[PDB]
Amino acid sequence: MREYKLVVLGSGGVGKSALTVQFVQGIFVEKYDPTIEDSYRKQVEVDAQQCMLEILDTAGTEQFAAMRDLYMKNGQGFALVYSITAQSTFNDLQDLREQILRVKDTDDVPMILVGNKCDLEDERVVGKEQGQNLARQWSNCAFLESSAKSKINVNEIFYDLVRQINR
Ligand SMILES: Nc1nc2c(ncn2[C@@H]2O[C@H](COP(=O)(O)OP(=O)(O)NP(=O)(O)O)[C@@H](O)[C@H]2O)c(=O)[nH]1
Ligand SMILES: [Mg+2]
């Protein structure tokens, strides 16, 4: 069983914790309690192998960007999450992507772009094609739309990072 160091990051309120807790506990967290930093270890199976996932659930609201440097250096795969209902959270993604690539000093890092809250179609402001096209611009990055609430594409976020790391 191999270890995989995964990092969930993105701006405040996008559902990083809701996705992570849905994945780990199978429960949807309705409260919005801002994260400082939480970590989970979970044994899962991907492609018929036991995998030990270390999942870092990070703060969306940081005092300064350099707070993220260490977990970027240590992380092997990154789920960059925005909310399809929150324009600013999509806008914020480029800084985060660039910071990962700078800190890890490389062009190619396992990553998936996640448009969360896809159950809130009435409130959608980020189009699906918009998200797909950003992922494409990011050197054909993986992309999905998820819902922690409706349990859509939650496991797939983490499984896809494992598969990327295995390449
Ligand atoms: N309808 C819906 N609501 C959601 C989804 N994900 C999260 N939420 C809700 O959005 C709010 C913020 O979620 P949360 O997981 O705390 O976001 P976060 O990205 O971890 N915030 P922070 O960066 O401060 O830690 C919560 O009220 C949560 O229930 C989703 O897929 N659909
Ligand atoms: Mg959180």
Residue ranges of domains in the chain, CATH in brackets:
1-167 (3.40.50.300)
What are the angstrom distances between the C-alpha of 99 and each of 64, 72, 95, 96?
12, 8, 6, 5
Amino acid at 96: L
61 beta partners: none
Of the listed ligands, the closest to the CA of 148 is: 1
Asked if residue 110 has its Cβ within 6 Å of ligand 1, the reply is no
Question: Is 89 near ligand 1, meaning CB less than 6 Å away?
Answer: no
Closest atom of ligand 1 to 120 CA is: 1
Angle among Cα 69, 89, 72 to the nearest 5 degrees reads: 15
- Contact, 58 vs 9, CB < 8 A? yes
SS3 8: strand
Query: 167 CA to middle of ligand 1, Å?
Result: 31
Nearest CA owner, ligand 1 atom 21: 13
Supply 161's token pair. 């990072």
Whether 31 has a binding-site annotation, put simply, is: no
- H-helix or E-strand containing 45? strand 37-46
Element (H, E) at 58: strand 49-58
Q: What Å distances lie between residue 113 and 50, 63, 64, 160, CA to CA?
A: 24, 23, 23, 11
Q: What is the resolution of this structure in A?
A: 1.2
Contact 16, 10 (CB under 8 A): yes
Residue with tokens 């390449």: 167
- Is the minimum distance from the CB of 92 to ligand 1 under 6 angstroms? no
In the PDB record, what is the listed experimental method? X-ray
Question: Contact 83/124 with Cβ under 8 angstroms?
Answer: no
15 lines ligand 1 (CB under 6 A): yes
Q: Is 33 annotated as a binding residue?
A: no
| Of 130, 92, 87, 116, nearest in space to 11 by CA | 92
Please state the atom number of ligand 1 nearest to the C-alpha of residue 34: 24
One-letter amino acid of 107: D
CA angle 93, 3, 20 (to 5 degrees): 45
Q: After which residues, if any, is the chain broken (C to N > 2.5 Å)?
A: none
